[PDB]
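During the second half of the funding period, the structural biology subgroup turned its attention to how the target accommodates small molecules. The most pressing case was 9JO, which had performed well in the primary screen but for which no bound structure existed. We therefore specified the complex as follows and requested a full 3D prediction, including the ligand pose.
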Amino acid sequence: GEAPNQALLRILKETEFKKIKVLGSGAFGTVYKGLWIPEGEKVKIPVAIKELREATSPKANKEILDEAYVMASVDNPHVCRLLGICLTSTVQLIMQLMPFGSLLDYVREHKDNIGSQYLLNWCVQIAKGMNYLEDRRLVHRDLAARNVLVKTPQHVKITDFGLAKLLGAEYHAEGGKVPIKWMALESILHRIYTHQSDVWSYGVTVWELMTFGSKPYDGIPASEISSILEKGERLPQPPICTIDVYMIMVKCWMIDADSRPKFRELIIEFSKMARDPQRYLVIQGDERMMDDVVDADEYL
Ligand SMILES: CCC(=O)N[C@H]1CC[C@@H](N2C(=O)N(c3ccccc3Cl)Cc3cnc(Nc4ccc(N5CCN(C)CC5)c(C)c4)nc32)CC1
C-alpha cells in the first residue's frame, strides 16, 4: 500500500500563545489572530488560532482533529501549514497567520490596483500548491478563491482543507453540503472526486481571479448546473482575458476528466504567460499599479 505518513503532530501549551483579536466568528467557534512564543526559543510567530466554542460536541471535536491530521500531512510553500494543536478543554488548531485574508476578498477589495503580473503569478502559485497535493495523493475537493489566503500580495497559499481527503492506497462522498458551482460534472452527478476534478475547480478559481471576484453562474440555481454543463455551456470569457488564458480555463472544464490539463502543465503554461503578462491579460492602467518576530515559514 501507501508509504508511511511520518508527519509530526506538535502539541502546544496554551500558555505559549496569546490571542490578540478576532479574525472570524462562527457557530462552531472563533479564529483569532495571535502570537506563538515557544518557551525558551526567543521567537514570536504570528499565528491564526482556531478554537472551538463550547466543545462538548463530539462531532466538532472529531472534525477539527481530522483537519489537524490533514494539515500536518503537508509541507509546501503554496499550502498552509499547521504549527500544532493544543488540547485544552476547548481544542485549538494553530496555523500560520495569513495577514491579508482570503484572495477572494483581496481581489474584490483591490481590483483597481491589481496588475496582470500578480494575477498570473497567483495562478502559478495555486497550481504549484495543487500539483504538490496531487503528488501527496490528496484531493482537495473544495478549491476556490475563498479558500486561498494571502501571506503577502506576492505569495498566496491554499488552505481550508475542510473537505480534503487523502486517497487510500477516486474518492466517493456521501451526501452533504457541497459547492456545486465549483465542481466537476462527475462530482455533481456521481459524487466522484479526483485530482482531475480538482483541475475543474482550479479553472473556476482562475475565473474568479480574472473577473476580480465575480460569482460564477450568478443567480442560477445549483439544481440547474448539471444540465447546463451537459448542454455544453461554461463560464464566459472574462473581459481582461486573452483567448490564450480563457482557452486554459475551458480545457479545465472538459467533460472527459483525462482531457483536462494536469496541474503540472498549468504551472508551465501560466509561467510562460507570467514572463510577458500584458501579452496575456489586458488591464486598464496595468503598467502603473516585535524584535523577535519570525514567519512560520522560516521556523523549522
Ligand atoms: C469563523 C469562520 C471564518 O470566518 N473563517 C475566515 C476567518 C479565519 C480564517 N483563517 C483560518 O481559518 N485558518 C485555519 C484554516 C483551517 C484550520 C485552522 C485554521 Cl486557524 C488559518 C488562517 C490564517 N490566516 C488568516 N488571516 C486572515 C483572516 C481574515 C482576515 N480578515 C479580517 C477583517 N475582515 C474584514 C476580513 C477578514 C484577515 C485580515 C486575515 N485566516 C485564517 C479563514 C476564513
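Two results from this model are relevant to the next phase. Residues 23-26, 31, 48, 50, 67, 93, 95, 97-99, 101, 105, 149, 159-160 surround 9JO (CB under 6 Å). The longest strand covers residues 17-25.
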